[PDB]
Amino acid sequence: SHYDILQAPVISEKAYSAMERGVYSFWVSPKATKTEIKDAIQQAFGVRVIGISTMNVPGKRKRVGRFIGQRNDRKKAIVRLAEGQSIEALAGQ
Amino acid sequence: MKRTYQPNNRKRAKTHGFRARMKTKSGRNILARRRAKGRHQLTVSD
RNA sequence: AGCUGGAGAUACGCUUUGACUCGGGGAUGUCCGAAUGGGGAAACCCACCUCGUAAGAGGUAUCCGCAAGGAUGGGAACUCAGGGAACUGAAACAUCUCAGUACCUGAAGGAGAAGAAAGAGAAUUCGAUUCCGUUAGUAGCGGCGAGCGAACCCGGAUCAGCCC
RNA sequence: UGUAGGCGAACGAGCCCUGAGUAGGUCGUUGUUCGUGAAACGAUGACUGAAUCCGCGCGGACCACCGCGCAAGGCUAAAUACUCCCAGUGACCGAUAGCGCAUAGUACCGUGAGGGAAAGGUGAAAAGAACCCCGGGAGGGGAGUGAAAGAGAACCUGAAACC
RNA sequence: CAGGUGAGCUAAGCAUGACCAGGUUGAAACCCCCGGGGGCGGAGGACCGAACCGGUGCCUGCUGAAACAGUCUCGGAUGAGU
RNA sequence: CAGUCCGCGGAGAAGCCAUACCGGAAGGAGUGGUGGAGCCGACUGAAGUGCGGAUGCCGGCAUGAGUAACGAUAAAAGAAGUGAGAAUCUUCUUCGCCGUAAGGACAAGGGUUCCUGGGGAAGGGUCGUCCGCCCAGGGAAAGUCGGGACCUAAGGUGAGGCCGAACGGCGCAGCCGAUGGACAGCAGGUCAAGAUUCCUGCACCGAUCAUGUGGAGUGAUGGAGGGACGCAUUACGCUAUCCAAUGCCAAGCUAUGGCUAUGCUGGUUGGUACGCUCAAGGGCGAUCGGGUCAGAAAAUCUACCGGUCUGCCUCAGACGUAUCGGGAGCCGAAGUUGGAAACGCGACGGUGCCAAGAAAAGCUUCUAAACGUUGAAACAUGAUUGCCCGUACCGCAAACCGACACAGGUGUCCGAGUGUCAAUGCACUAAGGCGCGCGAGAGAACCCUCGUUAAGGAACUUUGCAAUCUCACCCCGUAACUUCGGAAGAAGGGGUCCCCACGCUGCGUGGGGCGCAGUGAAUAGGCCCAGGCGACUGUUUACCAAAAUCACAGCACUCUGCCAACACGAAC
Ligand SMILES: [Mg+2]
Ligand SMILES: [Mg+2]
Ligand SMILES: [Mg+2]
Ligand SMILES: [Mg+2]
Ligand SMILES: [Mg+2]
Ligand SMILES: [Mg+2]
Ligand SMILES: [Mg+2]
Ligand SMILES: [Mg+2]
Ligand SMILES: [Mg+2]
Ligand SMILES: [Mg+2]
Ligand SMILES: [Mg+2]
Ligand SMILES: [Mg+2]
Ligand SMILES: [Mg+2]
Ligand SMILES: [Mg+2]
Ligand SMILES: [Mg+2]
Ligand SMILES: [Mg+2]
Ligand SMILES: [Mg+2]
Ligand SMILES: [Mg+2]
Ligand SMILES: [Mg+2]
Ligand SMILES: [Mg+2]
Ligand SMILES: [Mg+2]
Ligand SMILES: [Mg+2]
Ligand SMILES: [Mg+2]
Ligand SMILES: [Mg+2]
Ligand SMILES: [Mg+2]
Ligand SMILES: [Mg+2]
Ligand SMILES: [Mg+2]
Ligand SMILES: [Mg+2]
Ligand SMILES: [Mg+2]
Ligand SMILES: [Mg+2]
Ligand SMILES: [Mg+2]
Ligand SMILES: [Mg+2]
Ligand SMILES: [Mg+2]
Ligand SMILES: [Mg+2]
Ligand SMILES: [Mg+2]
Ligand SMILES: [Mg+2]
Ligand SMILES: [Mg+2]
Ligand SMILES: [Mg+2]
Ligand SMILES: [Mg+2]
Ligand SMILES: [Mg+2]
Ligand SMILES: [Mg+2]
Ligand SMILES: [Mg+2]
Ligand SMILES: [Mg+2]
Ligand SMILES: [Mg+2]
Ligand SMILES: [Mg+2]
Ligand SMILES: [Mg+2]
Ligand SMILES: [Mg+2]
Ligand SMILES: [Mg+2]
Ligand SMILES: [Mg+2]
Ligand SMILES: [Mg+2]
Ligand SMILES: [Mg+2]
Ligand SMILES: [Mg+2]
Ligand SMILES: [Mg+2]
Ligand SMILES: [Mg+2]
Ligand SMILES: [Mg+2]
Ligand SMILES: [Mg+2]
Ligand SMILES: [Mg+2]
Ligand SMILES: [Mg+2]
Ligand SMILES: [Mg+2]
Ligand SMILES: [Mg+2]
Ligand SMILES: [Mg+2]
Ligand SMILES: [Mg+2]
Ligand SMILES: [Mg+2]
Ligand SMILES: [Mg+2]
Ligand SMILES: [Mg+2]
Ligand SMILES: [Mg+2]
Ligand SMILES: [Mg+2]
Ligand SMILES: [Mg+2]
Ligand SMILES: [Mg+2]
Ligand SMILES: [Mg+2]
Ligand SMILES: [Mg+2]
Ligand SMILES: [Mg+2]
Ligand SMILES: [Mg+2]
Ligand SMILES: [Mg+2]
Ligand SMILES: [Mg+2]
Ligand SMILES: [Mg+2]
Ligand SMILES: [Mg+2]
Ligand SMILES: [Mg+2]
Ligand SMILES: [Mg+2]
Ligand SMILES: [Mg+2]
Ligand SMILES: [Mg+2]
Ligand SMILES: [Mg+2]
Ligand SMILES: [Mg+2]
Ligand SMILES: [Mg+2]
Ligand SMILES: [Mg+2]
Ligand SMILES: [Mg+2]
Ligand SMILES: [Mg+2]
Ligand SMILES: [Mg+2]
Ligand SMILES: [Mg+2]
Ligand SMILES: [Mg+2]
Ligand SMILES: [Mg+2]
Ligand SMILES: [Mg+2]
Ligand SMILES: [Mg+2]
Ligand SMILES: [Mg+2]
C-alpha cells in the first residue's frame, strides 16, 4: 500500500548528518510521486511532513568480467518534518 | 573543419525513431526486417 | 529425497503431514507495441466518467451492424490476386527473350488455389477439381532467328457432390 | 542408465418457367504453342445490344449437315505446396570445416537503411599447488597432490616461418 | 533495373530568434547670404579596420599536427550581410 | 569417408621429430625421440582428394630497424615529501606563457568522466607512486529558474470532405509543434562532492476554507480593445561598472644611497521596509447623445457621427532612517569627494527612411444562456495546499563533432587595468588559468622560421615571385580626366620627446633640454604613367582554376483576359 514504496533508508554520512538535523532521506520507487511518498511517510511513521524534495538517480554503469551493464535507477527523496520530528528512534545508535 | 556528424537528439529520434518508422509501410518493413534478423537494437529508440 | 537457476561463491534455510523436478490446468500479470480515453520524439506526459472512505478497481479509438458479436496487427517459406523490371541471349539491336522471373502491394489459412462441364474431344467416347508419370520436345509458336512449347488418349495418388 | 516386453492416471490433446444491360457485335487489347497470322474461343476499357425449348453456345475465318453441351447465382474435404518448430537418420562437417555464431545478429562499422567477427580442450576426479625460497609485483625454484606438474591454470598435442 | 535509406555534410526555401569594436566621409531635405557660400542635418549594395564571414600569393606541410591545414599576406567588413 | 576381412593398442594408437634403408616415380618401411587415445594393412565403393604462383583469402612471423618520430620554439630551475623504484606524483620559493583569453557562465551534445578511499595490468606517444584509466562507496533536492499541466508561426497532422491500380496522394475546422508570446523572490551561507532548489532572513503567486467588511450581481468556446512587432540615426536623466586623491578605515614595516610619512599594501557596500526628501524621462485627453445600414443577434463594451471643459498618473535612479547581510583582517573597522560610463534601465522616447515590417492565448471590457437577487463581485486577516520532468561533471574542449589525451572546427552571454586620438586594436599586466605527458647533451654537412650585411642595385628571373622599402595621428600641398559625386590617403613636404612661463575649456604660443634616433618598443598604406577585359558592390568550381565566368540595374522580343500563360502531380 505504501510500505512497499519506501525502498530503503539512505545510508551515508550526509544522510546521517541531516538525520541529526531532523530531516530524513530514503530511496523510493522511481515511479513514485511526491504526494504519495509524503502520505506514505505520514502513514509509515505517524509524523507530519512539512517539506519535501525528490531526485531521480540513474544507476552507476558498472561491469563485471567484460560484461558491461546499467544498474537499477534509484529515486532519492528527502523530507523535513514539523517540530514533532525524531521519526522512529532508528538513528545511528 | 566541420564534420558530417552533428548529433542532435530530437533530430536523431524524429528521423529514425520507432514511432517515425511505424508511420510508413517502409518503416514497418524496417522494423520486421530487424526483428527477423534478430538485432538487439531495432531502432535509435533501442 | 533431495532442493536453494546457469553460477562455479558464502551465509540464510526449505523438505518424508511429499519438497524439487516433471506433465495438466487455474490466478496474478507494471509500461510500450495493432495501442485503442487524448498527446507523443515507443516503453513516457495530460485528462474525464461511474465504484465513491481511501488506498485501489472498471470504462472512455475507429469499421460493420438494433443486438449480440465480429474486424484492425503479426507470421520463416508455401498460396491466390492488383502492378510489374533490367541486366542478359539474340555474339550489334527495336519485335522476341531474359519473365509474368525479381520486386512491391493486398487477402488468408495450416495450407491455399480450383472444382461438380453453355467442357475436352472426334470414339456418336469421356463425366468434377487438384498432383505425379507419360504422351514429347510430338503438335505448334518464332526478325520462322535466338529460341519458346502444349493438350487429348493412357497409367497412378485422391475421389463426395451438395445447395439457391 | 537403459534396451526387448509389460503396465500407466483425477484433469490432457487426437476424423406458362430455367440466372440478361448479358450472350453477341465494332473499336483498343490480351491468355493458353497463338508475336494478326486464314485467328476461332475465352478476357475485359469504350459504344451498342438478342433468343427462348420447333430455344441458345461450341466444334479454330465462314456456310450446311452432323455431334458435344445449357452460360450470365453459391458452397464444397481429400490427394497438392512450404518448413519458423519437433523426432529420427547420414559412404554430412568436426573449430579457416560446418549456420555468421560450439552461440552473437554480440563486439565492432554506419546519421540511416544496413553490414558484421574471431571462437573451443587441466585432469580420472580439483585432489586446482599447504608450506619454504628470490622478487612490490609479475614470474620463477623447491615441497607436496597426482598415474603424468615431460598436466599448473598464457593448463592436449605443439608442425613452419621467425627470434 | 527494383524497392528502399539518407537535407544531422552540403545545395536552396520557410517560420522564428540572434550578431556586426572602433575611426573616416559628409547625400537629400531644412534655414540664412549672393545654381554658388555658410550652417545644419546624418544618407549610402560609401571608405578603413577588429570580431565574424571568405580564401588572394609564396612558403611549410606531402607514410602531415590535419583524408585539404599552418605562419605570414590578402578579399568584405549596414548589406545581394553572418 | 564407407562396406567387408585381418588385426594392433596405457609394456601405449594417431599426430609431431631425426634418420646413411627400400621401389622406376608418385611413394613406402625399419629404428629412435615426444605424445597419451585411438589406429594401421588388404579388397571394393564414393569424393569438397594432391598448390608456388591468381598485386589470390584467413593467419602468424620477418625486412626496412633499434631507423623516422614522441603531435606547435609559452622555456624551466632548486629544495623538501612519498615511495620497492621518481627528470615527470605531492607541496614550497623563484621563472616564463595567455589574459575580448589560453578567464568565467550557458546551449547543445556526451553520460558518472563529479567527490572520497584505494589500485598500477593495460589506455597515458618516455616514466609513473599520478589521471579524464581500474575498484568500491557517496553527491544530483525547486509552488517562484527552463520545459509541462497555457498559446500560436513554418511545418506535420487531420472525424467529415476531394482524389488515386493497390500501399496511398491531398485536405476546412480542430490538434501537435519553440527558435517566439505568456508568468509569482531576492540577499547571504555551506558537504569532500548539489544550489534563484537545501539552510537563514524577509517577500510574491494561485487555489480551498474560516472569521468579518461587503451585505448583492456574477458576468461565457460569442463581440470589442489590447497583446501587435521594421531599419538607420539621435536628444535628456540614470545604474551596472571602472579611475583619482594629503577622504575614511585596517596592518605592519622599514633598512639598500634616500623616504619616518603627505611613504608602502589592502578595503572603501548588497537586499528589504518606511519617507509631507531630490529626480530627468515616459503615458493620458474627458463624458452626453444619434443612426441603423457595422462588429451573427445581443450589448451599459467597441467602430461612425455630431455637442460639450498647462492638468493627472508615473517612477528609472538618487538621498535619509532602520534593519538584515556581507566586509578587510586579528570575532569584525571604515564606508568620503570628484570624474568617466554602456548595447543595460527610464520608454512601447524623437526624427528620418522605404524594402512598409507574425499569430494566439493570458489580459481589460460587454452582453447571450443560466444561476440568484436576507449566506453576491470584491477586499482584509488567519489557516491550509503547492504535482511532473531537467539541475552532478566537461561544456572554444583531454570529457562534444574530427577512427587519437588530434595545431582542425562548435551557437549565445560576461570579458578588468596602463598607455596609445578612439576601440573588443597593439604592448605589458590583475583575477583566473597554464608551461601544450619523452628527456638530456652537443654545437658538422644539409633543411625549416629568422636577424644583420661592403661595394652595386633587379644585373636575378617567365614575371621584382619573394624580402626590403612605405606605416599611425596633425598642418601644408596635390595632376590628365570626370557621369561634377570623384579620381584623393594622388603625388610631394613638414611636425611628433622632456621641462618651464603664458594664453584658452588637453591644446596652441614662446623658450630651454637630451639622444644616433622623439607614433623612440608593438600594431599601422609603396607610389606613378600607360594599356586589354568587365561598368560598378557582389557570386563561384567543399579539396590544384575567383577570372575577362556567373548574376546585376537598364534595355528588347515574345506570350499571357484569369479555374491566366507557366510549372509539381497515380488525379475533373
Ligand atoms: Mg522544499
Ligand atoms: Mg580485466
Ligand atoms: Mg568530416
Ligand atoms: Mg528512449
Ligand atoms: Mg555447481
Ligand atoms: Mg496511447
Ligand atoms: Mg495512436
Ligand atoms: Mg547481346
Ligand atoms: Mg538490351
Ligand atoms: Mg515474387
Ligand atoms: Mg506478399
Ligand atoms: Mg493478413
Ligand atoms: Mg477485339
Ligand atoms: Mg512477326
Ligand atoms: Mg566457422
Ligand atoms: Mg585454427
Ligand atoms: Mg552472423
Ligand atoms: Mg557496444
Ligand atoms: Mg604464471
Ligand atoms: Mg611444465
Ligand atoms: Mg606438455
Ligand atoms: Mg595456470
Ligand atoms: Mg586427454
Ligand atoms: Mg599445450
Ligand atoms: Mg560597404
Ligand atoms: Mg576611393
Ligand atoms: Mg565559397
Ligand atoms: Mg584593399
Ligand atoms: Mg610405444
Ligand atoms: Mg618416410
Ligand atoms: Mg587417457
Ligand atoms: Mg580417423
Ligand atoms: Mg578442390
Ligand atoms: Mg603454376
Ligand atoms: Mg601464396
Ligand atoms: Mg598477410
Ligand atoms: Mg640517421
Ligand atoms: Mg630523431
Ligand atoms: Mg612532426
Ligand atoms: Mg620540479
Ligand atoms: Mg635545501
Ligand atoms: Mg622513506
Ligand atoms: Mg616499475
Ligand atoms: Mg616545507
Ligand atoms: Mg573558456
Ligand atoms: Mg543535456
Ligand atoms: Mg578527479
Ligand atoms: Mg581521489
Ligand atoms: Mg602502470
Ligand atoms: Mg607506459
Ligand atoms: Mg601532472
Ligand atoms: Mg524538481
Ligand atoms: Mg523556497
Ligand atoms: Mg515556463
Ligand atoms: Mg497530410
Ligand atoms: Mg509551436
Ligand atoms: Mg525560449
Ligand atoms: Mg517569472
Ligand atoms: Mg563543512
Ligand atoms: Mg559548485
Ligand atoms: Mg544596430
Ligand atoms: Mg599618492
Ligand atoms: Mg457594467
Ligand atoms: Mg552582445
Ligand atoms: Mg485556441
Ligand atoms: Mg553547475
Ligand atoms: Mg545530467
Ligand atoms: Mg581524422
Ligand atoms: Mg584539440
Ligand atoms: Mg567591456
Ligand atoms: Mg581592455
Ligand atoms: Mg586603453
Ligand atoms: Mg589583443
Ligand atoms: Mg579549462
Ligand atoms: Mg607542464
Ligand atoms: Mg624567415
Ligand atoms: Mg648589401
Ligand atoms: Mg637607387
Ligand atoms: Mg638573365
Ligand atoms: Mg615585373
Ligand atoms: Mg604568370
Ligand atoms: Mg611581393
Ligand atoms: Mg577639364
Ligand atoms: Mg574636384
Ligand atoms: Mg598621403
Ligand atoms: Mg644632439
Ligand atoms: Mg627634432
Ligand atoms: Mg616608437
Ligand atoms: Mg617590430
Ligand atoms: Mg567584374
Ligand atoms: Mg568593395
Ligand atoms: Mg578549388
Ligand atoms: Mg584558389
Ligand atoms: Mg479544380
From Swiss-Prot, chain A:
CC annotations in GO: cytosolic large ribosomal subunit
Keywords: Ribonucleoprotein, Ribosomal protein, RNA-binding, rRNA-binding
Superkingdom field: Bacteria
MF GO annotations: rRNA binding; structural constituent of ribosome
One Pfam family cited in the UniProt record for this chain: Ribosomal_L23
GO biological process: translation
UniProt KW Transport keyword: no
Keyword Ribosomal protein: yes
Family the entry assigns: Belongs to the universal ribosomal protein uL23 family.
PANTHER family assigned to the protein according to its UniProt record, in alphabetical order: 60S RIBOSOMAL PROTEIN L23A
Entry function: One of the early assembly protein it binds 23S rRNA. One of the proteins that surrounds the polypeptide exit tunnel on the outside of the subunit. Forms the main docking site for trigger factor binding to the ribosome.
Quaternary data: Part of the 50S ribosomal subunit. Contacts protein L29 and trigger factor when it is bound to the ribosome.
Protein name, as recorded: Large ribosomal subunit protein uL23
Organism: Deinococcus radiodurans (strain ATCC 13939 / DSM 20539 / JCM 16871 / CCUG 27074 / LMG 4051 / NBRC 15346 / NCIMB 9279 / VKM B-1422 / R1)
UniProtKB/Swiss-Prot annotation, chain B:
Keywords for the protein's UniProt record, in alphabetical order: Ribonucleoprotein, Ribosomal protein, RNA-binding, rRNA-binding
Domain of life: Bacteria
RNA-binding among keywords: yes
InterPro entries the UniProt entry points to: Ribosomal_bL34 (IPR000271), Ribosomal_bL34_CS (IPR020939)
GO biological process: translation
GO terms for cellular component: ribonucleoprotein complex; ribosome
Molecular-function GO term, any one: structural constituent of ribosome
PANTHER family reported for this sequence: LARGE RIBOSOMAL SUBUNIT PROTEIN BL34M (PTHR14503:SF4), MITOCHONDRIAL RIBOSOMAL PROTEIN 34 FAMILY MEMBER (PTHR14503)
Role according to the record: Binds the 23S rRNA.
Subunit-level organization: Part of the 50S ribosomal subunit. Contacts protein L4.
HAMAP family: Ribosomal_bL34
Family: Belongs to the bacterial ribosomal protein bL34 family.
Protein name, per record: Large ribosomal subunit protein bL34
